[PDB]
Amino acid sequence: DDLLGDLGGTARAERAKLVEWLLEQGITPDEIRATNPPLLLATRHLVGDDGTYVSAREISENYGVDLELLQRVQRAVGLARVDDPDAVVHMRADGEAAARAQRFVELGLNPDQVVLVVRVLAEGLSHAAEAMRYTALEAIMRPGATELDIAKGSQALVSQIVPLLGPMIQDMLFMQLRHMMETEAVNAGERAAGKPLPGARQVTVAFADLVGFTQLGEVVSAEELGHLAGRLAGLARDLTAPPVWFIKTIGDAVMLVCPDPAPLLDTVLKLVEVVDTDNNFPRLRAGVASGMAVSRAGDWFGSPVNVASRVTGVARPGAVLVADSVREALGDAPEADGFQWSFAGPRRLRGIRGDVRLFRVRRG
Amino acid sequence: DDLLGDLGGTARAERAKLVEWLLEQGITPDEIRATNPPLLLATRHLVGDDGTYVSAREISENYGVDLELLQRVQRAVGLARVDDPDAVVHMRADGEAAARAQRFVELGLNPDQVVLVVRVLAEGLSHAAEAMRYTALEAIMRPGATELDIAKGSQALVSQIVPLLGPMIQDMLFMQLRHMMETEAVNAGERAAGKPLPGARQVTVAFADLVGFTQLGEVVSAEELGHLAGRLAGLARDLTAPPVWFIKTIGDAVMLVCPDPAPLLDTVLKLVEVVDTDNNFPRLRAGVASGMAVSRAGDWFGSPVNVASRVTGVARPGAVLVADSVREALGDAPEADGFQWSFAGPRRLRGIRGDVRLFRVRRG
Numbered sequence: 001d002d003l004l005g006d007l008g009g010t011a012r013a014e015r016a017k018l019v020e021w022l023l024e025q026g027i028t029p030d031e032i033r034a035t036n037p038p039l040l041l042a043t044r045h046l047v048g049d050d051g052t053y054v055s056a057r058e059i060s061e062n063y064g065v066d067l068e069l070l071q072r073v074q075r076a077v078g079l080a081r082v083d084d085p086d087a088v089v090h091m092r093a094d095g096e097a098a099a100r101a102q103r104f105v106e107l108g109l110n111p112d113q114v115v116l117v118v119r120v121l122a123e124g125l126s127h128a129a130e131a132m133r134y135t136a137l138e139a140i141m142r143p144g145a146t147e148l149d150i151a152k153g154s155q156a157l158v159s160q161i162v163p164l165l166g167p168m169i170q171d172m173l174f175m176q177l178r179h180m181m182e183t184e185a186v187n188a189g190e191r192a193a194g195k196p197l198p199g200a201r202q203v204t205v206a207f208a209d210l211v212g213f214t215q216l217g218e219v220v221s222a223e224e225l226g227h228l229a230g231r232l233a234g235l236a237r238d239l240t241a242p243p244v245w246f247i248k249t250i251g252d253a254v255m256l257v258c259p260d261p262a263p264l265l266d267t268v269l270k271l272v273e274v275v276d277t278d279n280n281f282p283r284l285r286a287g288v289a290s291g292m293a294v295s296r297a298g299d300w301f302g303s304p305v306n307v308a309s310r311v312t313g314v315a316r317p318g319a320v321l322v323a324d325s326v327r328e329a330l331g332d333a334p335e336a337d338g339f340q341w342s343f344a345g346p347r348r349l350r351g352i353r354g355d356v357r358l359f360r361v362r363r364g
Numbered sequence: 365d366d367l368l369g370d371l372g373g374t375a376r377a378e379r380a381k382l383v384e385w386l387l388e389q390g391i392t393p394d395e396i397r398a399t400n401p402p403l404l405l406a407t408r409h410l411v412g413d414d415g416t417y418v419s420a421r422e423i424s425e426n427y428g429v430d431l432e433l434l435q436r437v438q439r440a441v442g443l444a445r446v447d448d449p450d451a452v453v454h455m456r457a458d459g460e461a462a463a464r465a466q467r468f469v470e471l472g473l474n475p476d477q478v479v480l481v482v483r484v485l486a487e488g489l490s491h492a493a494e495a496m497r498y499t500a501l502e503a504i505m506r507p508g509a510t511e512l513d514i515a516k517g518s519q520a521l522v523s524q525i526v527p528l529l530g531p532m533i534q535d536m537l538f539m540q541l542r543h544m545m546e547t548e549a550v551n552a553g554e555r556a557a558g559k560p561l562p563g564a565r566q567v568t569v570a571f572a573d574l575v576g577f578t579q580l581g582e583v584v585s586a587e588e589l590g591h592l593a594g595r596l597a598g599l600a601r602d603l604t605a606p607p608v609w610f611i612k613t614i615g616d617a618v619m620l621v622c623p624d625p626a627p628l629l630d631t632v633l634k635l636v637e638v639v640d641t642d643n644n645f646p647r648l649r650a651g652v653a654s655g656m657a658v659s660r661a662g663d664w665f666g667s668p669v670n671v672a673s674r675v676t677g678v679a680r681p682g683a684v685l686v687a688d689s690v691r692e693a694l695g696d697a698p699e700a701d702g703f704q705w706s707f708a709g710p711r712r713l714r715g716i717r718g719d720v721r722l723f724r725v726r727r728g
Contacts, residue, residue: 011552037549037551044542047538047541047542048538048539048541048542049542075602075605077539077540078540079543079606080543080606081605081606091542093535093538093539093542094539094542094543096535097535097536097538097539100528100531100532100535103528104525104528107521107524107525107528108503108521109499109500109502109503109525110499110502110503113495113498113499113502113503114499116495116499117492117495117496117499119601120491120492120494120495121488121492121495121533121536122536122539122540123488123662124485124487124488124489124491124492125488125536125537125540126540126544126662127484127488127661127662128481128484128485128488128537128540129537129540129541129544130484130544130548130659130661130662131477131480131481131484131485131661132481132541133541133544133548134477134560134561135473135474135477135478135480135481136473136560137550137560137561138473138474138477138560139472139473139474139477140560141555141558141559141560142558143556143557143558144556144558145555145556145558147555150555157471157472160471161468161471161473164464164467164468164471165534165537165538166534167464168464169485169533169534169537170529170530170533170534171457171460171461171464172461172485172486172489173489173492173493173529173533174411174412174457174461174529175412175441175457175458175461175486176441176442176486176489176490176492176493177411177412177493177496177497178408178411178412178413178455178457178458179443179444179458180490180493180494180497184494184497185401186501187401188375191505191509191511191514192507192508192509193507194505194506194507194508194509195505196498196500196501196502196504196505197498197501199586199587200585200586200587212715213670214670214674214714214715214716215715215716215717217665217666217667217670218667218670218715218716218717221564221656222563222564222656222657222658222665222666222667223563223564223658223665225665225666226658226660226665226666227660229665230660237483238439241439241445242443242444242445249663250614251663251664251665251669292585292586293586294586294587294590295494296590296591296594297491297494297495298487298490298491298494299613299615300615301581301586301587301589301590301593301615302581302586302589302590303581303582303586305615306577306578306581306582310578350578351576351578351579351582352578352579352582353579353582
């Protein structure tokens with residue numbers, strides 16, 4: 001029509017049949033032109049978008065929130081930064097969602113702490129929106145498919161799993177909320193001081209990372225490499241069980257941290273030994289350190305972390321390598337231990353004044 | 365009573381008065397002993413926990429999910445790994461939450477893709493449960509406070525902001541869902557192939573990182589350092605606005621990635637120049653590279669990322685440093701540009717066969 005321009009052949013053929021199927025689904029000829037590819041414009045009117053887009057300012061008149069606060073959550077959301085209130089860009093449903101921030105401040109909450117939740121939430125949730133957008137497609141897309149084939153199948157699917165998400169995620173938050181766990185605690189020293197966070201806790205932190213990964217991907221493909229690292233991520237994610245925390249991955253490397261060494265110390269040991277079995281991986285090295293560190297919403301800072309990070313840089317393939325920090329964090333093992341300490345020699349790290357008495361560890 | 369053992373003085377005094385205030389709030393003498401500190405046992409019966417804990421197996425009889433699938437979401441949740449079904453450890457409300465996974469598989473979804481959402485969700489949500497647990501405390505805790513003072517104030521507060529969360533987060537998911545954005549797209553090549561994910565996209569990726577950070581914390585405290593990095597994190601988080609993505613921080617460093625260089629290229633430039641103003645920071649170096657990379661739920665893999673990472677290792681303080689990859693990703697600037705290219709010389713990276721023609725860039 002007045003729309004499907006530059007495209008040629010079967011590419012052009014299909015988009016036509018699809019496009020008509022959309023003007024039926026109540027999608028404006030602009031709306032299509034307003035997004036490319038336009039397949040899931042069908043499926044987008046299912047999760048909110050009504051076609052009505054609204055102005056930053058008037059989200060305020062309508063719903064009843066302060067403009068300056070609204071504006072700073074709209075930016076904290078992780079998204080479509082406009083500066084100017086009067087514009088009519090923002091889509092209506094994203095307004096009503098951002099207007100929900102006011103009642104929280106109104107109830108006595110720091111508008112800056114309130115913005116932190118609004119942010120951290122919308123980053124951890126965008127990362128889920130990836131796993132969801134894609135989980136849907138494994139179940140629709142087989143090769144050889146027309147644009148309309150996907151839309152139709154998607155369209156039907158989402159519109160069945162959609163009512164499931166609202167209640168599902170709430171339950172998921174409260175679960176994570178009521179179990180918000182063990183060193184979250186603020187004891188007397190931190191409670192008398194009137195500190196709302198916790199401060200530095202004494203912990204062992206460890207990193208395990210795949211050897212040569214960085215010119216592995218200069219040979220293997222991005223998706224190969226990507227998937228490869230992803231395997232190890234989930235490989236680690238299920239040898240770790242409370243009391244140890246799998247805190248994050250940093251692409252190729254994995255960072256785990258727990259209060260006392262044994263649990264962590266063994267979990268790293270087990271994992272590097274597992275990887276030494278499985279032959280898709282190049283083998284792991286791990287570095288371990290112990291000391292004073294503070295947790296700030298999923299990341300750890302402190303000097304254990306800097307020196308575990310540096311130790312793994314120097315670890316050999318196969319080897320779990322260990323700072324003296326953790327040799328003593330264990331201290332006088334109560335009765336038996338089950339580790340094999342094998343003094344590695346003092347090694348002068350980079351960034352560290354003094355040098356570190358390092359230690360190889362093995363199982364059994 | 366039969367409870368407040370080892371404690372001495374005003375430490376012991378307060379816990380008593382508190383504890384009594386709890387047996388009133390319908391908290392069992394075991395329940396208290398079952399968690400220490402026990403302040404928020406009050407506040408925990410507000411977000412789910414009824415006092416009834418249930419068995420892994422019978423979550424199945426009751427709610428109607430398969431045991432093996434249940435078990436693998438209970439482990440994917442990020443939490444309390446039991447192996448044995450018959451045990452009565454799991455608390456009831458965490459059952460009903462995990463039982464919600466079945467209807468999703470039942471609707472035609474990969475039980476393994478379903479587990480990925482269940483995981484990614486409960487990691488990004490635990491990270492929010494931190495910002496929430498703490499946001500509450502800024503608003504309660506002042507110094508000089510008794511255990512009962514916090515409980516009482518918390519208890520009242522949560523029980524007001526609790527009905528707000530259910531509806532608030534749903535709206536937050538759909539917002540992130542309906543806006544699930546631009547290179548998420550799978551075009552013809554990736555759609556004909558029948559690939560549910562997207563594959564390697566051509567992008568510029570950049571890292572900016574604070575100089576000397578690693579023996580900064582060998583002098584300054586964990587919480588100082590931690591906060592310091594956190595400042596820069598949010599400092600970056602608001603100079604970045606679509607079309608560029610602030611993907612993650614790795615403690616001290618920040619990683620941002622966008623399809624075309626200019627936006628990213630300038631955002632890094634602006635930020636390192638801002639930091640060069642503010643005097644709490646040591647100054648930034650940034651590294652930038654361009655090429656083929658795949659996004660796998662919030663992380664990027666590919667060789668741009670490996671070589672941007674390596675370039676920043678070699679960048680000087682103040683300097684945004686740049687690979688040839690991006691010199692051309694820009695290519696024939698359409699009309700004007702606004703950057704100052706200042707060839708840095710070829711530098712042999714670590715992990716990279718060949719060496720890279722590097723390039724300093726400045727504003728104006």
